[PDB]
Amino acid sequence: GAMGSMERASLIQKAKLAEQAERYEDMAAFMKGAVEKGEELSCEERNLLSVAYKNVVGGQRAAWRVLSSIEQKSNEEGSEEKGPEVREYREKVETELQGVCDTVLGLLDSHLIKEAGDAESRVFYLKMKGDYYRYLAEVATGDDKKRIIDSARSAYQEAMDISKKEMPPTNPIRLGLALNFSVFHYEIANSPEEAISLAKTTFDEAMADLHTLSEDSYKDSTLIMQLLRDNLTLWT
């Protein structure tokens, strides 16, 4: 890879610079290079990896949604035909998005997940795996849409099982996992009641555990609890 000649520590340092510069494609490439050094990632390094690709795919997803909306309008009654260009460019963005998702899933499979033994790392990576299959599912339409959906569900479910056994209900990784699994249920799996039940139970169990936390941990947990609350307000 193009980062194979750069020191692991230099790649991590440059990932942090790229974040400050809001250069998230650079950040992702640096962190991909760091993963490919073959050593496990620390907590801070895992979060750098996640932030980088979240921002890259976030921009791709936003663009895909703009283009898909334009495409769908062009296919309504009375719409003037403007040729293949809208579909072509939507497919271009979609293919680039899928390539990023495939890259992340490839890193997780080679070999982040199999070497992740601690609950905090294993849950983190399995959540990521569910997230990037979910992003694939957002754009999927063909023979393997159901398998993509079930791959997201399976990854989220294994992460949930571990997190419930090994993590307190206020753990921010556990909370963000439950948040995203609930979004999966609502937006991908056509299961809004499951989405709502998971968000409410997650919120309530974290509420009851806040008294154990320091002020700093309390702030971390309540931040994600508010996102659960925001979604419940949207959904109910």
């Binding site: 997230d131 995203n180 996102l227």
Partner: peptide
């Protein structure tokens, strides 16, 4: 819906 970072 809001998802995590």
């Amino acid at each position: 819906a809001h998802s995590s970072x």
